[PDB]
């Protein structure tokens, strides 16, 4: 089709426009959305070359096939700016895309549809379905532990692993690690793939909470998620991820249990007087007691004493308080269990009532 044209209700266009814009934020066309009209469907695509988000919008009114690309932010802002219940009539006119509603007319610049980037064809090796709430829980339980710009580029993302009847996520930045697993109720083949951090965040933002199930397809070099009328696709990170099974502390001989909120609030107050750069806190564990101390270069000091359940040997251990607070904020449970070994070894932190997630934090030298 050479003369693309469609008419849609604003209410059917807004959420798809906001969603496909997710990967956006170098190449000029990357600031544009690809619009394609064919046989009762409008497709909207946004990409950053590593991932792509597609939305399908049913066209209930007469339309003409074709394709173009338009500035995403401007097109979204025009549609959002129109009144509730507006009908939006769109058509290509030469090299301009016209947007009309009531007595409002907008002429936008375009870039050719033929020039829009496309991810290569691929075959899925594994397919499964799960509730959006389950995928959201897995990602939220671990995403804070991904690295940002580590040279070990495989850490700037999240491991997605199928094993038995479970889907598992793992994230680590070399200082701390998070692992969460959930049952899928389907026997799955064994697969482990690394999703880029930007893709993890977009996948997480696509999970609208709602009851539409999520269908996942994994290839050797790509992952795809289908949720309602949206399709997210991302390239995978081609590297070797660490094995969480070998990162978990072996035989922690010291088990501390305490209220999650009380522990979180005590660490949050101690953090105020920690070094702004190093963020170090000192923990002293003794019979049924935890003492948390923090000091800074001005020699200001915070001290918190908590009653806890503990009967192991006395020990002192240092931690970056932001890493501890990140774990306690991710747990959102009543009680927490901290499993220790010695002052130079990692700690494992878990919800005292559930083994679905586990967190590992490496200490600081005291």
């Amino acid at each position: 089709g050479s003369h693309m044209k469609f008419t849609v209700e604003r209410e059917h266009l807004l959420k798809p426009l906001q969603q496909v814009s997710g990967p956006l934020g170098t190449l000029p066309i990357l600031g544009n959305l690809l619009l394609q009209v064919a046989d009762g469907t409008l497709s909207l695509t946004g990409t950053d070359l590593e991932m792509e988000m597609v939305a399908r919008v049913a066209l209930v009114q007469p339309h003409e096939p074709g394709a173009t690309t338009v500035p995403a932010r401007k097109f979204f802002d025009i549609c959002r700016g129109l009144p509730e219940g507006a009908e939006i009539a769109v058509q290509l006119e030469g090299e301009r895309m016209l947007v009309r509603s009531g007595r409002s007319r907008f002429s936008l610049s375009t870039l050719p549809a033929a020039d829009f980037p496309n991810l290569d064809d691929w075959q899925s090796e594994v397919e499964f379905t799960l509730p959006q709430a389950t995928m959201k829980r897995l990602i939220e339980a671990t995403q804070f532990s991904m690295a940002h710009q580590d040279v070990r580029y495989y850490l700037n993302g999240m491991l997605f692993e199928t094993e038995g009847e479970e889907l598992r996520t793992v994230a680590t930045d070399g200082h701390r690690l998070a692992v969460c697993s959930m049952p899928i109720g389907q026997s799955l083949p064994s697969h482990s793939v690394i999703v880029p951090r930007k893709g993890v965040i977009e996948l997480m933002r696509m999970l609208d909470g709602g009851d539409n199930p999520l269908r996942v397809q994994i290839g050797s070099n790509n992952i795809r998620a289908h949720v309602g009328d949206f399709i997210f696709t991302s390239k995978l990170v081609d590297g070797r991820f660490p094995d969480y099974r070998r990162v978990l502390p072996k035989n922690p001989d010291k088990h501390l249990e305490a209220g999650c909120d009380l522990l979180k609030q005590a660490f949050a107050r101690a953090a105020i007087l920690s070094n702004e750069k190093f963020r170090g806190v000192r923990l002293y564990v003794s019979e049924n007691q935890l003492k948390i101390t923090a000091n800074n270069p001005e020699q200001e000091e915070a001290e918190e004493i908590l009653d806890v359940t503990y009967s192991g040997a006395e020990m002192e251990i240092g931690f970056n308080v932001s890493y501890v607070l990140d774990v306690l904020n991710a747990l959102k449970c009543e009680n927490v269990r901290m499993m220790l070994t010695d002052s130079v070894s990692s700690v494992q932190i878990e919800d005292a009532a559930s083994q679905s997630a586990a967190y590992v934090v490496m200490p600081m030298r005291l």
Partner: peptide, 6 residues
């Protein structure tokens, strides 16, 4: 900060 043995 010490490193996790990855």
């Amino acid at each position: 900060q010490a490193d996790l043995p990855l």
